[PDB]
Design a protein around this ligand. Structure first.
Ligand SMILES: [Cl-]
Ligand SMILES: [Cl-]
Ligand SMILES: [Cl-]
Ligand SMILES: [Cl-]
Ligand SMILES: [Cl-]
Lengths: 101, 96, 101, 96, 96, 101, 101, 96
């Protein structure tokens, strides 16, 4: 579901990621997701517009927008958080990456 | 064993006949959380099953041959859903 | 398309595979396929009911029914042959693997 | 570069903005032989494009981030289809 | 962050500058248990560091670019070993 | 060998890369390499200090310094070119990535 | 270290493996190892001396000699046991696989 | 077939006994271009062999079990080097 954060049930690649695909579009075998990385791993210089900073619990995470990928629904784990309140920032990040707007 | 769900916490249903014994691989259909697919997705092709209190969708179109050495513990039995599973598989291959 | 044999555009132990999914069922991102292997690689003691032998050119190939897999359409190459005339054998192989008898 | 088709799982359309340099990767949409999908499959979500005399479907839902080091030679330019490509992507993310 | 040790219980040291944001990856050097290598192996090229009560060897020649999304929790800080790490890296590239 | 550009035997990840490891340091099973990418894939706004632009034949390539990796010698293909004349730029790129302040 | 049994840090595979490389030979990035599998009666044609049975705790394990592989030292876990007392059997298994006339 | 060289340009030498064949796997030692290793690298452990003009190093320490289904065409025969290959393998396991 869009704006929900899930865990990955596989080996490497990611730990956490945000589902950014519309809830009316069923692939249905996959979902478009944006992986999250520990905010401490990126400096303050890195654009918060392309790579928004979100809070899951008490920790800060960066949305690695440019590492967006299609992931099979069978590997999507448990729902960890909801980032619906950040809809505007997420939308801007995605629109910026594709349309430079 | 046919219609049993196993782990390797990823889930999959064994859909191969119990008579096909020699092959070192079992045909399985992966399960996905039902909340991940809308109700508009065909229940004929992607049946919805229950394991515990949760709902899962059978990702019929992601069927795959998996080595028996990676098949984990038996989590549930879906024998009572034999008819739905059979229809899903027959629809994907011959389906009308 | 069902019963058509195609080349694989990925790194695989197999160079040819047969599309066995219905033409009325669009996933649409994947197709159910059965890989082909050189017949010389399997002894005659291996069931011809479950592993049909087909011909493409001057070579004999075995259908590795038990290695059936869902493959993305983007990796399906050029059409090499048509096995429509073997529909009955292919159907029996698939029905045997799932429903036995 | 945006709307350009490149080779390597053989054909991909670069759909990332030219103003956004990752710079190690690019967002791409894989192409599949149009003959592999029936006409009943939405052209809004999966546009049909022509490279040479052959027809290809844009597998929008299989979009992925790909390292620039694996992007091959430029095969074609789909700038004239900008509107269709834009609609496909916007539909997948914001569709109502 | 440079000179910090992270989890993958696999361990590796971030050796990339903090002023250089890829930003999707980080250059890291994997750590291996010191008991696995004899004392005859160069400590100049493969420095020995301590994390807790265990000794680890820096597998400098196995250095690799790793995506930030797979970097786990910070386990230790090896800033005090900056000189040894710097020498190991400079030796591998420039023959010191 | 240092400053030499080679091809990659496997079909994945790389196509061409530059060996940047010292010739006096034998791993000996691996070599530190920097992958090359078509220069047209990156805009001119991308730092030439960190990502040098080199020429191999008539084509321009960018050195993807931040994607540096250890690669087994068994997968290193044929020698395509020599970039010894660019030693200073390559050295600066590497030193900047590790020791930049 | 030779004849020591370790736990793995990577995915898939077995669970335990025996280091069979000489202690005087430092690669130093890899170690030759033989994976262990839960003891079971084999059907593998000739030789049961090709797959020695060893004990770790109260359990029995078979040395899958033919699945020997080079493994990076960074993925070798904690030392679980020592099979130095079985040196002769291990040596014979390895010599049989390579030179077994 | 022991002492021979097969592919999948890639190159590897089959070093398993011809007596042992039941597993669908063969022990192989990968070959690397001799130019990739300096002359200071032991020829006892990493023998140098020739195949159609070029020189190759046997990467003894990268020995691995490979499935027979992925072994390609026979490119050469190194039976005449049996003694060197045997010594390399014995050295790696028994220290000379
Ligand atoms: Cl139910
Ligand atoms: Cl896939
Ligand atoms: Cl067109
Ligand atoms: Cl220390
Ligand atoms: Cl130049």
């Amino acid at each position: 579901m869009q704006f929900k954060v899930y865990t990955y049930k596989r080996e490497s690649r990611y730990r956490l990621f945000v589902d950014v695909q519309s809830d009316i579009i069923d692939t249905p075998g996959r979902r478009m997701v944006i992986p999250l990385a520990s905010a401490r791993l990126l400096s303050d210089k890195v654009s918060r517009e392309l790579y928004p900073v979100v809070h899951i619990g008490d920790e800060s995470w960066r949305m690695m927008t440019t590492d967006m990928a299609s992931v099979p629904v069978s590997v999507i784990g448990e729902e960890v958080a909801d980032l619906s309140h950040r809809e505007n920032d997420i939308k801007n990040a995605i629109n910026l990456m594709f349309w430079g707007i």
